[PDB]
Amino acid sequence: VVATLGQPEREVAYTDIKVIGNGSFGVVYQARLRELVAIKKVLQDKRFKNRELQIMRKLDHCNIVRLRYFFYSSGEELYLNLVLEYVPETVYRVARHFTKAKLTIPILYVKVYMYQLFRSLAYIHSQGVCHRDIKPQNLLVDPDTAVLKLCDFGSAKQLVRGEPNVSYICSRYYRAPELIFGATDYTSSIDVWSAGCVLAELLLGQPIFPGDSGVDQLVEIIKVLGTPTREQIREMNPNYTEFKFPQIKAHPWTKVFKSRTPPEAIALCSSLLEYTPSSRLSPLEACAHSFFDELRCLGTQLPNNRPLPPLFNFSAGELSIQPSLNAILIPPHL
Amino acid sequence: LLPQKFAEELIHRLEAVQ
Numbered sequence: 001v002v003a004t005l006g007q008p009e010r011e012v013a014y015t016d017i018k019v020i021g022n023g024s025f026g027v028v029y030q031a032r033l034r035e036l037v038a039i040k041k042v043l044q045d046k047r048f049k050n051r052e053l054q055i056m057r058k059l060d061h062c063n064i065v066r067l068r069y070f071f072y073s074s075g076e077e078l079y080l081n082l083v084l085e086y087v088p089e090t091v092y093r094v095a096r097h098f099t100k101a102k103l104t105i106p107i108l109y110v111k112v113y114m115y116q117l118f119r120s121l122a123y124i125h126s127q128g129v130c131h132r133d134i135k136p137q138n139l140l141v142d143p144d145t146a147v148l149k150l151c152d153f154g155s156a157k158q159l160v161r162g163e164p165n166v167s168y169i170c171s172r173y174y175r176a177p178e179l180i181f182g183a184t185d186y187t188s189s190i191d192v193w194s195a196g197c198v199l200a201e202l203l204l205g206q207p208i209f210p211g212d213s214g215v216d217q218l219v220e221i222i223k224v225l226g227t228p229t230r231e232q233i234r235e236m237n238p239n240y241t242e243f244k245f246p247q248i249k250a251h252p253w254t255k256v257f258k259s260r261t262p263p264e265a266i267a268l269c270s271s272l273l274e275y276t277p278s279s280r281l282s283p284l285e286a287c288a289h290s291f292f293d294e295l296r297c298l299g300t301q302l303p304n305n306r307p308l309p310p311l312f313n314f315s316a317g318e319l320s321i322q323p324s325l326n327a328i329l330i331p332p333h334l
Numbered sequence: 335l336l337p338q339k340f341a342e343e344l345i346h347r348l349e350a351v352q
């Protein structure tokens with residue numbers, strides 16, 4: 001198969017293919033090279049560009065899955081096939097293994113993985129890309145090196161001020177409250193909300209907001225955060241300000257997590273899981289949170305007697321997003 | 335989809351847990 005090089009244009013032959021994902025929004029396979037490769041097939045309108053392909057071409061980060069190649073197939077009808085870097089595990093599978101084993105994920109792994117998620121969101125938002133599907137199933141992780149990579153940019157979109165966008169987006173457990181309220185003017189801070197849900201899930205061993213419907217998803221959030229004020233509703237969807245919603249007391253933040261949950265981990269959760277989207281931490285601000293202070297200490301290593309993954313190789317563009325946080329992000333050493 | 339309808343379901347569900 002002749003395929004164009006991912007990162008300039010450009011001969012590919014693969015082996016050991018297997019279907020690991022079906023349904024609408026495409027079909028996903030795995031392949032071999034002697035490397036490992038992922039294939040995703042989607043139906044594409046020949047008259048328009050593929051949104052994900054243009055997104056994947058624009059991005060280059062150590063915490064983003066690499067687009068190796070891409071090629072077309074007819075089927076008879078055009079199908080775009082995206083040749084993607086293969087990563088052995090997902091955060092969902094690792095978390096499920098720990099819960100199935102009735103064990104808690106060590107906080108250092110939670111620290112290492114969450115930092116790379118927030119770093120990836122800082123990068124994509126700098127390039128004007130909103131993931132819109134941030135969930136553990138879309139977080140690739142290497143079991144040994146503990147590097148995290150963001151993938152599945154099918155729902156990704158460049159949110160332009162003034163352009164309405166679909167409200168019913170993201171997976172339900174990680175959907176921001178303004179989306180459930182039907183907001184069409186939402187921003188990339190919805191990715192931050194989903195990242196907050198992922199962090200809480202890793203500390204709790206189960207999703208923090210397990211909604212069985214759109215309405216009950218908002219009920220599950222209110223049971224934790226309390227009923228949002230009318231002013232918080234105004235920033236989410238001003239069409240809901242004049243309803244009289246029952247006032248539910250907020251469950252204390254320290255009372256929703258386990259006894260041994262670190263105090264700063266709870267603090268980070270409260271700073272990201274905010275009703276008002278503008279009050280949520282920026283992805284770089286989350287990286288600068290004290291919850292990640294261990295990763296910046298001189299001498300911290302992975303539990304499996306291995307060094308920490310790349311966490312401070314920030315590019316000049318990365319250094320330019322929020323200059324004030326760069327004192328924390330790069331420690332005195334390095 | 336209608337805010338009036340959605341709010342009432344939210345209210346009725348919220349009172350069931352209050």
Ligand SMILES: CC[C@]1(c2cccc(-c3c(F)cncc3OC)c2)C2=C(Nc3n[nH]cc31)[C@H](F)C(C)(C)CC2O
Nearest residue numbers: 020029038040084085086087088089090137138151152
């Ligand atoms: C091959 C896809 C995975 C992945 C995980 C989650 C989402 C997507 C995905 C995508 F990337 C693009 N579009 C749609 C998608 O899913 C709906 C892809 C993949 C592995 N490894 C990967 N390397 N690269 C991408 C992936 C993991 F190791 C498994 C085998 C444990 C599980 C797995 O499915």
